Structure formats: structure tokens, C-alpha cells
Design an enzyme around this catalytic site. Structure first.
Site, short mmCIF file in Angstrom:
data_model
loop_
_atom_site.label_atom_id
_atom_site.label_comp_id
_atom_site.label_asym_id
_atom_site.label_seq_id
_atom_site.Cartn_x
_atom_site.Cartn_y
_atom_site.Cartn_z
N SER A 71 10.49 3.97 5.01
CA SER A 71 10.99 4.89 4.58
C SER A 71 10.53 5.88 4.33
O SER A 71 11.28 7.00 3.78
CB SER A 71 10.24 4.44 2.81
OG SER A 71 9.23 4.51 2.96
N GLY A 106 9.64 -0.42 3.59
CA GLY A 106 9.41 -1.99 4.14
C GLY A 106 9.42 -2.88 4.81
O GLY A 106 8.64 -3.83 4.66
N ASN A 154 3.87 -0.07 7.71
CA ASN A 154 3.88 -1.47 7.10
C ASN A 154 3.20 -3.05 7.88
O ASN A 154 2.30 -2.99 6.75
CB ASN A 154 4.89 -2.01 6.81
CG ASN A 154 5.95 -0.68 5.29
OD1 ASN A 154 5.59 -0.69 4.81
ND2 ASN A 154 7.15 -0.57 5.92
N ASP A 189 3.45 8.00 -7.44
CA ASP A 189 2.54 6.81 -6.66
C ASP A 189 2.12 7.51 -5.94
O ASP A 189 0.81 6.72 -5.47
CB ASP A 189 3.67 5.64 -6.23
CG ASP A 189 4.36 6.21 -5.30
OD1 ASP A 189 4.64 7.07 -5.23
OD2 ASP A 189 5.26 5.26 -4.85
N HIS A 209 4.92 7.76 -2.19
CA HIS A 209 6.30 8.43 -0.79
C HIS A 209 6.52 10.02 -1.63
O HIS A 209 6.69 10.03 -2.62
CB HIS A 209 7.33 7.18 -1.14
CG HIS A 209 6.73 5.53 -1.25
ND1 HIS A 209 6.48 5.10 -2.67
CD2 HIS A 209 7.38 4.72 -0.15
CE1 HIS A 209 5.97 4.03 -1.73
NE2 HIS A 209 6.98 3.53 -0.81
C1 LIG Z 1 0.83 4.18 5.74
C2 LIG Z 1 1.58 4.19 6.90
C3 LIG Z 1 3.26 5.07 6.58
C4 LIG Z 1 3.70 4.04 5.71
C5 LIG Z 1 5.28 3.90 5.87
C6 LIG Z 1 6.52 3.15 5.46
C7 LIG Z 1 6.30 3.13 3.41
C8 LIG Z 1 7.75 2.37 3.14
O1 LIG Z 1 8.59 1.28 3.69
O2 LIG Z 1 7.52 1.53 2.06
#
Ligand SMILES: CCCCCCCC(=O)O
Length: 178
Positions: free
Chosen positions: A11, A45, A74, A155, A158
Site C-alpha cells: 500500500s 497488504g 507487512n 489511522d 497510511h
Molecule cells: C511500516 C512498514 C511499511 C508498511 C507498508 C505496508 C502497509 C500496507 O500494505 O497495508
């Protein structure tokens, strides 16, 4: 010619709960116009193993010149063993090279949990692999984005749509030497 940069991400590259066209790789594609094509192949994810599973079809379809690998976060958010994430990323890098593409590996780091040992072991895999393969190690943007509430979704996890032009411009600067 007009080369293709494939982004194999989660993401952070796909953009969480937003249109593909709003995410920074699409904005980067727009910035670059017809000089270089950016194909975003990122899914929210995804673990490194899930990205690996998708990769061969993408290499065949897109025949990219470079593949930016942005994966493993992830795995780490789920407390997966770092050695396994390392090995999966190793396989990704092998596949990219065997497809005659140049891998670009983005450093990933995790938010706080308990102590430093796990997070340090996780982050260490990225410079290790970049050295092993002799590939570019790209810096991680997420901690800096998280400092701007106006760039984060409710949140606090993100980045939002407003973040994306900033990330695009920053990534353009990091990728220009390509
Ligand atoms: C903190 C490590 C980076 C996270 C990226 C992945 C978040 C997601 O795909 O939901």
C-alpha cells in the site's frame, strides 16, 4: 526509447483506499510523460511472498528495464522472521535480474513495538541485500510523511491523497539518476 519502471509494492506504493491515479507512482508517470513509463503493480497488504508470487507474470507482461521493490513491511508488521523475508526478497532480486531488469531495493523500517532487536534485524536485511546484489538502495519515506498529520489518514498509519504529490516529487528526485 521509453523504458518501463515497474513498481512491485504494497500500500505504500498502491496508495491505501484511493484511486490508482492518485497514488504517487501514477503521479510520477504523469511527471515523466512519455520519457519513461511507470507501471504500478502494488497491492495493499501484500507480503514479500505475495509480491514474489505476482512477479513472474509481471516481468513477462511488462518487460521492465527496472523494478522498484518496495516489500517486506507487512511481513515485519506481522512479526515474521527476518531471515524469511530476506530470502523472499533475495528471490525477487534474482528473478528481476534473470529477466534482464535492474532491481532497485527500497529500504523498509518498522514502527515501534518492543525493544530494538527485532526492528533492527528487520531493517538490516535491506542494506545487506543491496550490497549482496550490488543494486541501488533507495531511502524510506514513511517516517517523514508520518510527521505531517495533514498527509496521513485518520489511522495515523497510511499516507493520504494529499501526501502523494510530495512523495512523487521526492521519489522523482531519488530516481532521476536512473
Ligand atoms: C511500516 C512498514 C511499511 C508498511 C507498508 C505496508 C502497509 C500496507 O500494505 O497495508
Amino acid at each position: 526509447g521509453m523504458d518501463t519502471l515497474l513498481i512491485l509494492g504494497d500500500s505504500l506504493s498502491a496508495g491505501y483506499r484511493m484511486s490508482a491515479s492518485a497514488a504517487w507512482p501514477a503521479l510520477l508517470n504523469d511527471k515523466w510523460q512519455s520519457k519513461t513509463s511507470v507501471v504500478n503493480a502494488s497491492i495493499s497488504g501484500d507480503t514479500s511472498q505475495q509480491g514474489l508470487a505476482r512477479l513472474p507474470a509481471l516481468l513477462k507482461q511488462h518487460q521492465p528495464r527496472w523494478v522498484l521493490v518496495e516489500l517486506g513491511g507487512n511481513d515485519g508488521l506481522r512479526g515474521f522472521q527476518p531471515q524469511q523475508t530476506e530470502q523472499t526478497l533475495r528471490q525477487i532480486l534474482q528473478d528481476v535480474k534473470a529477466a534482464n531488469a535492474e532491481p532497485l531495493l527500497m529500504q523498509i523500517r518498522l514502527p515501534a513495538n518492543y525493544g530494538r532487536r527485532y526492528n533492527e534485524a528487520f531493517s538490516a536485511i535491506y542494506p545487506k541485500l543491496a550490497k549482496e546484489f550490488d543494486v541501488p538502495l533507495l531511502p524510506f519515506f514513511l517516517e517523514e510523511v508520518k510527521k505531517k498529520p495533514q498527509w496521513m489518514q485518520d489511522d495515523g498509519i497510511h499516507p493520504n491523497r494529499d501526501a502523494q504529490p510530495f512523495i512523487a516529487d521526492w521519489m522523482a528526485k531519488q530516481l532521476q539518476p536512473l
